[PDB]
Predict the structure.
Amino acid sequence: TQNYGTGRRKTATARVFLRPGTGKISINNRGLDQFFGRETARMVVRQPLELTETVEKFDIFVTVVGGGVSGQAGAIRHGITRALIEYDETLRSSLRKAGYVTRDAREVERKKVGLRKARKRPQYSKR
Amino acid sequence: AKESMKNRELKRQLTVAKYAKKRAELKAIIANPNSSAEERWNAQVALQKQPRDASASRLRNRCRLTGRPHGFYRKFGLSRNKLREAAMRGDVPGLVKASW
Amino acid sequence: PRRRVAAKREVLADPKYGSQILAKFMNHVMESGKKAVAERIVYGALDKVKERGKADPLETFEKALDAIAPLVEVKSRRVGGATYQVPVEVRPSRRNALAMRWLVDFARKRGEKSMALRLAGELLDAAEGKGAAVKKREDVHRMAEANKAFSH
Amino acid sequence: PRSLKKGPFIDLHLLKKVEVAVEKNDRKPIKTWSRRSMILPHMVGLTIAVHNGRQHVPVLVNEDMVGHKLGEFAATRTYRGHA
Amino acid sequence: AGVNIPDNKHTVISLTYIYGVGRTTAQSICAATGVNPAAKIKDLSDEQIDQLRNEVAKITTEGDLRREINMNIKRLMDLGCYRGLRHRRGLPVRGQRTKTNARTRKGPRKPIRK
Amino acid sequence: QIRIRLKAFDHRLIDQSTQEIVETAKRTGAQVRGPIPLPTRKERFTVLISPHVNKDARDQYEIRTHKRVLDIVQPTDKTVDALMKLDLAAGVEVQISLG
RNA sequence: GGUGGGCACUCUAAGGAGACUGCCGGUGACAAACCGGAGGAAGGUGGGGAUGACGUCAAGUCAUCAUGGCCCUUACGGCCAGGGCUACACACGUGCUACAAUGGUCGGUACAAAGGGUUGCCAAGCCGCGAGGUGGAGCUAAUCCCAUAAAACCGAUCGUAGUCCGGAUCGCAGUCUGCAACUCGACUGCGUGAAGUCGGAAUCGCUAGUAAUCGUGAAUCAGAAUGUCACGGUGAAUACGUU
Ligand SMILES: [Mg+2]
Ligand SMILES: [Mg+2]
Ligand SMILES: [Mg+2]
Ligand SMILES: [Mg+2]
Ligand SMILES: [Mg+2]
Ligand SMILES: [Mg+2]
Ligand SMILES: [Mg+2]
Ligand SMILES: [Mg+2]
Ligand SMILES: [Mg+2]
Ligand SMILES: [Mg+2]
Ligand SMILES: [Mg+2]
Ligand SMILES: [Mg+2]
Ligand SMILES: [Mg+2]
Ligand SMILES: [Mg+2]
Ligand SMILES: [Mg+2]
C-alpha cells in the first residue's frame, strides 16, 4: 500500500505519505490548523487534493523541515503532487496544466563584492 | 617595516614569554573570590612592579616576512599582499580561487 | 526594453473569495513584503462594506473599479519648442492597474482611524462617483478631451 | 570607571612620594607625569605639578576633587577660539 | 488631581508626568500600593490617591531634583575639571565628535559672519 | 573493533586511501561498515589585491577539508597499523580509535 | 530516536544520467536562423559566479615589498615617559535612527541557512532588576558549546496627541577587558526627555526570489562596527515602445 513523495521548495524539504483514509492530515505530528494559522497555506497545501478531487479519501502523514512557512507549504504541495502522480500515474497532464509538478528553481541570489545587496549599489555622487 | 620595528616586537615577544606565569597567578590572586584585601593589594603592587612592556596586550602581530602591521591573517602568518603571492604560486596547500 | 523579451508571471491565488482581482488589489496595498497585514486590511475593509448595508462587498468592489478606470490617457511629447500632450486610448490591462493605484493612493491620505476604514470609505464614496479618485479621473478625462486636436 | 574589586589605582612612585610628603607638611609641589592616578582622600591640601604634554601645571588639591584623576586638571589642547 | 497631573488617562502613564518618575518607577509605585495600573485616575476614590501621594513623596519631585542637579553641574563647573570646562562652553562632555555633528549642544548652524 | 577517521584537503587521494584500506580489509577476511562521508568544512577569505586604495577590487579564496569515516567488525589481523607509512602517504591525517 | 534495531526515507559526498534547437508545424535564398507546439525538473548561452583582448589615462602605489640616482651619518639613526592622530565659528560625501495606527507596549506561540571553539568555546546549579559574578560538566567536534532567530500569527491596551511616537542630550550609581578606560572604550540601572508633522533647487538604486523589509555569522580583535564580507525568512509594481 501507501505512496511516498519528496517535495522541495526554497531550502525546505518535505516527506509525504499517502494511505487509504479519511483526510486526517498531520504535519510534524500536529494538526494542519495548528501548523498553518489563518493564511493561504491551507489553500496551497490542499490545492492538488481538490483539483484531483481526492481530498476526502487519502490519509496523509508529513514530515517537513527547513525554510520558512511559505517554503514549507510549497514543499508539502510538491511532495503531495509527486506521490499523487505515482499512485495513479495517468493524470500527469492534469497537474501539468496547473503547474504543480514543475519544481520552482528560484533561490536566494548571493551577495556580490562591492555591492550592498545582490543588486543594490551605493548612491554614486559624481561630484 | 623598519628593522627597528621588527627588532622591538621580537624583544616584546621574548619579554612577555619571559614571565608568562607570574602574571597568571598574580591575576588569579587579584580576581580570586575570597582572598582578603591585603593579598589583593600585594598582588597588585607586585604585578605593577613588573616591566610595563611585558604584557600580552602590547603585542601587535605583524607579517613574518615584511612586518606589516595591517592586513594580518592568523590562519596563515602572512599579511594581505604576501598571502596572495604565496597562494598564486600554489605554495599554500589547500588554497584555491572559489566562486560558489 | 529594446529587445521586447519580458514575459509576464502567473501568481494569483485568492484564498477565500476566489476572486482573481482581489489578489492583485492586495498586492497593490502590500508594503515591504508583509502579505498578511495587507490581507487583513483588505478583509476588514470588505467586512465593513458588507455590514454597512445589503450590497455584496465584492460586487461593490468591482462596481467601484469600473466606475474609476479611465478611458483615455494624456501622453506628453516635445515637438521642438513646446511640449504638447496628445490623447490616447488606455489598454484594457492598464485601466485596472491605474484604477487600483489611484484608489489606494487616495485612500492613503483620507484621515480616519485605521487604513481599513480609509479603504472602506473610499469604496463607498467612489461607488457612485463622489471620491477624490473619481474626480481625478474626471480631471484626466477633461484634460484629454481638451487636447483632441492632436489625437490622430 | 574602574571596577570596585580594586578600590583605587595609584602608582607606586607617586604613592611613595605622597606618603613621604606628610612627615613635613605641605611646602613644595610634587612633580609627576602620572595623569592616570586617582587622587586619594589623604593627600588633600598639597600641590601637585602634573605633566601636560609641554610643561607641568600646578594643582592645589582640596576635598572636592578627591575621586577624580590628576589628568582631569591639565588640558592638553588650547583652542583659544576661531574668532 | 495630582500636582497638575494629566487626567482621563491610565494611572501609570498619568503618574509618569511628575519629573522624577519614569515608566518603571511608576510601575513600582502602583505595585507597592495596591491600585490597578489600567485604571483612569478620574475613576479612583481619594482613599487611594492619598496613598499614591504618600508613596510618591518617598523619592524626589520637581524643585529638589532640579536643585541637586544644578548643584552637581555647578560643582563640575567650579572645580575646573575637563568635564567642567567642556560643560561651561556648551560642548559634548562624554567625548563625542565636534568636527561635525554636535548640533544638540549648539542649536542652529550659526554661519560665519552673517 | 577499531574506527578510522580520515582527513584531507582534496578528494582524489582521500578516495584512494579509503579504497585501499577497504580492499585490504576485505582481503584480510574482516568486515567493514561502509565508509561515511562527513560534511566538508569550507573556510573562505576575501583579500584586497591592490597595494593601495582600490577597495572594490577584491579576490576570494577558499580551503576545503574532506572527512571520511571507516570502522571494522570482526578483526583478527592488524596490518592497518603495519601500513603506517602507506595508509597515510603524503597529506592524509589519520586518527585511530579503539586500538 | 530514549533503547533494541532498520537500510525504507531526508540528509551528507564521490561517481554518473540528463538539455543537445533533440522531435513536430510555419516562415526563410527549401542556407544560417526565426515564431510557436508536445514531452521534461529544467528550452533555447536554464539562474548566478570566476574568466578583463591590443592598448588608454607619463592614472595609483618609492609607505606592503623590491629597486637606479640624490641626500643625513653626535642624527633625517636608536631607546623611553607623557600628549597627538578623537581639536571645531563652518562646507561637502557615505550611512544609521525616526517623524508613527500597514504602528508603539504587555502576554501566548511557529518556522531557517551559514560559520566558529583546546593560549579555546565556556554549559546545568546558585547569586543580582540588569550588564554580570561563582561553578565546573561536554567537546581537538553531523556528538558538546557559541545558540533564544526576528519580522509573521493570536489575545489585550493606546485612539491621532509632539503622544504609551522619537530617541539625542545631560545627572547619579555600576559591570567587564586591560599595568592603566581623564584626555579617549563597550555595555547596564534609575531619571531627564531635544530636533523631528515626510523634507527647496537638485539628485540615486533597482527588471524576479529582484527592489522593499526582518534577523544571523565571520575576518581584524585583550576590549571596541550604524563599516566590510557572507547567510537565510517574507515578498511586490512595472516595461505600450525607441518619438
Ligand atoms: Mg545562496
Ligand atoms: Mg550628489
Ligand atoms: Mg627595509
Ligand atoms: Mg592590539
Ligand atoms: Mg510544457
Ligand atoms: Mg516550449
Ligand atoms: Mg568565456
Ligand atoms: Mg579582473
Ligand atoms: Mg602623475
Ligand atoms: Mg600623485
Ligand atoms: Mg608613546
Ligand atoms: Mg582619522
Ligand atoms: Mg518608546
Ligand atoms: Mg539588467
Ligand atoms: Mg537577504
